[PDB]
């Protein structure tokens, strides 16, 4: 995976998101904080139970951001496991 299509595939997602909300920079920060939050609720040595986090939450937070604008949501969903149908 030196530079698989998936790599540029991901970059395109983040890029488009940036160029999309050029007027609303605050949006960019949030999205990144979402994926970032995931990482936070992972470390801390042993994964002791305490309402952690995973892909499910990230999907919600990002969805909350891109409300109505499910266009970008579709891209994010591609990475996440497809639900029913």
């Amino acid at each position: 995976e030196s530079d698989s299509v998936e790599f540029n595939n991901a970059i395109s997602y983040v890029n488009k998101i940036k160029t999309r909300f050029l007027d609303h920079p605050e949006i960019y920060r949030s999205f990144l904080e979402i994926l970032h939050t995931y990482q936070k609720e992972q470390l801390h040595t042993k994964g002791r139970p305490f309402r952690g986090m995973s892909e499910e939450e990230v999907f919600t937070e990002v969805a909350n951001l891109f409300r109505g604008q499910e266009d970008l949501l579709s891209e994010f969903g591609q990475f996440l496991p497809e639900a029913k149908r």
Binding site: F7, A10, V14, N15, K18, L35, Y38, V58, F79
Partner: peptide, 13 residues
């Protein structure tokens, strides 16, 4: 999959 997106942000930034 998240690794690519999360990492992607750093690339552009």
């Amino acid at each position: 999959n998240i690794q690519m997106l999360l990492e992607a942000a750093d690339y552009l930034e």
